[PDB]
Amino acid sequence: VAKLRYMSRDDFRVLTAVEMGMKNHEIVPGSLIASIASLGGCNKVLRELVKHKLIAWERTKTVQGYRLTNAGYDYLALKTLSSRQVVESVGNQMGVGKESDIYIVANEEGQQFALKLHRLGRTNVSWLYLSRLSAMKEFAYMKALYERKFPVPKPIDYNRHAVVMELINGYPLCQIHHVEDPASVYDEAMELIVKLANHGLIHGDFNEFNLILDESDHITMIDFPQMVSTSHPNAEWYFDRDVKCIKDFFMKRFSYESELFPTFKDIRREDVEVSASGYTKEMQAD
Amino acid sequence: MSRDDFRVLTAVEMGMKNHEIVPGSLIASIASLKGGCNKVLRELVKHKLIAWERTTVQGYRLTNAGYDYLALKTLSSRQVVESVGNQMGVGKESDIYIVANEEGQQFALKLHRLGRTNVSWLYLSRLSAMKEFAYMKALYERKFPVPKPIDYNRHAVVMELINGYPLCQIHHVEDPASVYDEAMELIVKLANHGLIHGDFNEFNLILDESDHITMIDFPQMVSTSHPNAEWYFDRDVKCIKDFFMKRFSYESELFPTFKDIRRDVEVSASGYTKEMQADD
Numbered sequence: 001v002a003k004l005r006y007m008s009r010d011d012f013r014v015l016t017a018v019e020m021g022m023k024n025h026e027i028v029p030g031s032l033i034a035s036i037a038s039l040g041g042c043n044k045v046l047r048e049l050v051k052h053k054l055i056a057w058e059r060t061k062t063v064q065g066y067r068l069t070n071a072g073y074d075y076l077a078l079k080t081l082s083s084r085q086v087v088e089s090v091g092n093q094m095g096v097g098k099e100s101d102i103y104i105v106a107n108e109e110g111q112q113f114a115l116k117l118h119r120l121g122r123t124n125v126s127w128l129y130l131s132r133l134s135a136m137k138e139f140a141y142m143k144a145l146y147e148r149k150f151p152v153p154k155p156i157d158y159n160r161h162a163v164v165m166e167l168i169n170g171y172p173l174c175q176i177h178h179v180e181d182p183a184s185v186y187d188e189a190m191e192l193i194v195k196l197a198n199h200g201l202i203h204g205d206f207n208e209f210n211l212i213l214d215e216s217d218h219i220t221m222i223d224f225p226q227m228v229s230t231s232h233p234n235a236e237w238y239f240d241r242d243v244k245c246i247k248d249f250f251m252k253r254f255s256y257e258s259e260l261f262p263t264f265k266d267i268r269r270e271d272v273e274v275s276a277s278g279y280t281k282e283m284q285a286d
Numbered sequence: 287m288s289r290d291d292f293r294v295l296t297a298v299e300m301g302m303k304n305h306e307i308v309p310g311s312l313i314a315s316i317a318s319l320k321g322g323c324n325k326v327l328r329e330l331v332k333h334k335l336i337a338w339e340r341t342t343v344q345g346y347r348l349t350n351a352g353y354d355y356l357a358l359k360t361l362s363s364r365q366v367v368e369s370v371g372n373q374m375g376v377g378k379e380s381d382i383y384i385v386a387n388e389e390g391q392q393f394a395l396k397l398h399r400l401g402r403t404n405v406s407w408l409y410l411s412r413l414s415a416m417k418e419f420a421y422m423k424a425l426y427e428r429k430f431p432v433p434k435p436i437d438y439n440r441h442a443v444v445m446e447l448i449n450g451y452p453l454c455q456i457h458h459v460e461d462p463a464s465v466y467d468e469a470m471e472l473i474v475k476l477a478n479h480g481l482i483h484g485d486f487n488e489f490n491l492i493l494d495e496s497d498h499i500t501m502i503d504f505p506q507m508v509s510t511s512h513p514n515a516e517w518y519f520d521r522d523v524k525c526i527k528d529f530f531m532k533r534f535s536y537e538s539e540l541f542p543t544f545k546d547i548r549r550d551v552e553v554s555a556s557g558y559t560k561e562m563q564a565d566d
């Protein structure tokens with residue numbers, strides 16, 4: 001149990017207590033944090049967590065207490081991943097997903113991976129829950145898609161709002177101004193839309209920001225937060241919208257256009273949702 | 287439904303907050319009958335209001351019919367909904383029905399359906415409905431063309447019934463330019479208030495008898511502060527242009543640009559969500 005010693009420290013215990021109270025409270029009173037933490041040393045720990053910006057103090061006309069900050073939630077997830085030897089160091093923020101921040105991380109051996117920290121919700125309670133669910137969904141769908149030979153990063157690990165995955169050696173399509181053969185890349189992006197639809201899925205946000213181009217000009221999909229089922233009554237519109245977004249990008253960036261693009265009637269169903277739901281339930285159990 | 291059947295149905299809901307599958311012993315403990323909880327559970331399964339599940343764990347879950355009943359029984363007790371009358375349509379993550387109160391006044395009912403696991407289905411469906419009620423309140427108070435919000439419970443939102451049809455069902459309009467301009471002005475007004483619809487289309491824009499547009503579904507709005515807000519804004523503009531060209535053969539060179547945006551609804555909506563989370 002030596003690997004879990006940092007999870008036993010007082011600051012981690014108090015941070016976990018703030019997270020626990022945040023399940024039913026928008027602002028966690030110190031008395032409740034102290035009661036949950038069951039360490040006394042509590043107030044001194046709270047003051048250091050505030051100093052390190054891991055928690056923030058909040059006053060309401062009826063309540064006073066603390067909330068976990070984004071840095072505090074990141075700390076809990078990153079220390080958990082560190083205990084498993086998955087993440088030893090966190091580097092530069094490389095980019096953004098629709099509802100997440102992307103960083104390069106390294107394990108003890110120095111091998112690099114991508115870390116996605118999910119951030120969703122406009123209240124403390126829904127932020128805690130939605131960020132975790134968004135990461136859980138990404139890990140479950142990434143696993144289900146990777147097993148079906150889809151071009152997605154290999155999923156490595158998960159904790160709270162954090163997903164660790166394979167670091168793709170490439171750049172998002174939005175940062176690419178020159179490509180050797182625009183037609184091949186356009187065909188590869190269109191084939192991804194088709195493969196998804198044949199598996200019952202419509203991306204919903206298919207664009208130059210979530211498609212990574214490697215040194216061989218091969219595309220990897222790295223963000224898919226709000227996929228639509230091909231069974232949705234308005235699935236055709238969602239499918240056509242994804243096709244059109246990539247057509248607009250190829251015209252604007254590469255001056256490339258084609259009359260050869262996918263049609264929703266051309267889909268032929270080959271289940272991903274069943275596998276992803278099974279993985280989500282396994283993760284929810286733990 | 288008897289008071290005991292409703293007490294047990296509520297106990298299943300309560301146990302579902304922390305359990306993927308709710309054990310009968312826990313349902314019995316929560317319901318606190320004073321007993322016959324097992325007999326009630328078996329009738330609730332028979333009526334498909336709850337379902338039995340068995341993996342290490344065994345127990346019950348609420349079905350969509352059971353969750354609907356709980357929300358509709360609450361709305362009926364408040365005199366908001368007396369009758370429900372079949373599906374009129376769909377939102378991105380909801381089913382839409384016409385409902386009537388006791389006095390025969392009609393409203394629209396949206397039942398939110400989100401989540402692929404029992405725990406997340408219960409929470410996400412409730413949150414999706416709460417978010418819709420909070421944003422509809424925040425938008426309606428700022429004179430946006432949205433239905434007036436009436437009431438909310440669980441995954442259910444009751445709202446004003448717009449006398450009109452979705453733009454997708456409209457094949458002829460007197461002046462396409464006016465409707466186009468009204469749809470573009472809505473995108474601009476939203477952006478000036480810090481919002482991007484994200485799903486702006488012919489399926490969620492209702493056209494009334496005077497050719498005025500009402501926005502009826504907005505599940506995944508994007509903030510104008512999002513790092514990729516401009517793309518979301520342009521995508522919404524382009525979808526409208528695509529529909530107007532395809533349906534009415536109408537095109538214009540007068541369309542919004544993200545740089546033309548002069549910047550609160552999110553603050554109001556978050557405040558309403560926190561008020562509703564407190565009473566949940």
Ligand SMILES: Nc1ncnc2c1ncn2[C@@H]1O[C@H](COP(=O)(O)OP(=O)(O)NP(=O)(O)O)[C@@H](O)[C@H]1O
Pocket residue numbers: 093094095096102104114153165166167168169170171172175212222
């Ligand atoms: N979400 C992702 N999953 C896996 N690898 C990624 C992801 N996003 C970027 N990368 C990789 O991160 C590495 C270094 O990224 P970096 O250039 O520092 O930031 P970035 O420009 O936002 N990302 P990128 O352009 O893809 O390199 C590259 O090898 C990328 O392919």
Ligand code: NA
Pocket residue numbers: 143144147275276
């Ligand atoms: Na699988």
